Write an enzyme that holds these catalytic residues in place. Structure first.
Site, PDB file in Angstrom:
ATOM      1  N   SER A 115     -13.820   3.019   7.938  1.00  0.00           N
ATOM      2  CA  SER A 115     -12.526   3.643   8.193  1.00  0.00           C
ATOM      3  C   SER A 115     -11.398   3.099   7.326  1.00  0.00           C
ATOM      4  CB  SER A 115     -12.131   3.497   9.667  1.00  0.00           C
ATOM      5  OG  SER A 115     -12.850   4.410  10.486  1.00  0.00           O
TER       6      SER A 115
ATOM      7  N   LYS B 268      -5.387  -1.811   8.017  1.00  0.00           N
ATOM      8  CA  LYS B 268      -6.298  -0.748   8.430  1.00  0.00           C
ATOM      9  C   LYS B 268      -7.686  -1.354   8.574  1.00  0.00           C
ATOM     10  CE  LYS B 268      -7.299   3.327   9.745  1.00  0.00           C
ATOM     11  NZ  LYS B 268      -8.365   2.671  10.548  1.00  0.00           N
TER      12      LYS B 268
END
EC number: 3.5.2.6
Length: 260
Positions: A42, A206
């Protein structure tokens, strides 16, 4: 030295550790397996939101285009898109859900909106990132098979791309601030790089996770207290169904930041 520390850490956790740290204040870098490919999982969603924020320069009104979608778009991890199924969301709202929650359906809706998988790959080439390659959609891109080149980048390439985007001038200041902000308000990374950092530095990040216990985190760190720092920490293991090791990312982070 730093090698042996990182080599022992990754050995003790039965896996392979990929690290790139950039300090634009001194220009210096730190690499460990920095040119080896790792499955990005991701963390690619950072490049995805940057690609939308990039286009928001040419097309300002893009961040407000309203996207309707369907039950068939929903995935196991789709907290925001699931909630809004009967109402739809704006492109800007999908970006925020994508970055700040890692919403897989939001990511897929943004890929399609950008022009498909090829459009994401094109964007990376356009900022001089020759390593990034997106080959599948969510959630298939998280299989993370050993030595599999699909959906990979290198730590050095991801760090260089993040540096250009969050701190460099690849984006205008508002877009850059928007990207930092989404990163800064990420809710998924409390136990990774943010843990191993000084407790008053502000971090934007992230995460990613996948099979083979793959545990990733990419971050910009603002010391109070010095020049900004870009840190990429990728970790993947040998057993397909291994538990994720966010502690290893924490350990690697404090080992690295010891060198500053």
């Amino acid at each position: 030295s730093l090698d042996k520390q990182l080599a022992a850490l990754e050995h003790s956790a039965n896996g392979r550790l990929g690290i790139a740290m950039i300090n634009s204040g001194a220009g210096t870098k730190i690499l460990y397996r920095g040119a080896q490919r790792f499955p990005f999982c991701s963390t690619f969603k950072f490049m995805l939101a940057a690609a939308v924020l990039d286009q928001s320069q040419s097309q300002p009104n893009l961040l407000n285009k309203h996207i309707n979608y369907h039950e068939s778009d929903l995935l196991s991890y789709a907290p925001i898109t699931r909630k809004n199924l009967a109402c739809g969301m704006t492109v800007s709202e999908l970006c925020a859900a994508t970055i700040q929650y890692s919403d897989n359906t939001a990511a897929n809706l943004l890929i399609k909106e950008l022009g498909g998988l090829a459009a994401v790959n094109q964007f990376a080439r356009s900022i001089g990132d020759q390593m990034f390659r997106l080959d599948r959609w969510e959630p298939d891109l998280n299989t993370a098979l050993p030595n599999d080149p699909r959906d990979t980048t290198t730590p050095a390439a991801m760090a260089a791309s993040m540096n250009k985007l969050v701190l460099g001038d690849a984006l205008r200041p508002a877009q850059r601030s928007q990207l930092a902000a989404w990163l800064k308000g990420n809710t998924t990374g409390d136990a990774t790089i943010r843990a191993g950092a000084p407790t008053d530095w502000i971090v934007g990040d992230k995460t990613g996770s996948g099979d083979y216990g793959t545990t990733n985190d990419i971050a910009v760190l603002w010391p109070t207290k010095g020049a900004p720092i870009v840190l990429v920490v990728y970790f993947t293991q040998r057993e397909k169904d291994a538990k994720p090791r966010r502690d290893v990312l924490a350990s690697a982070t404090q080992i690295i930041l010891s060198q500053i």
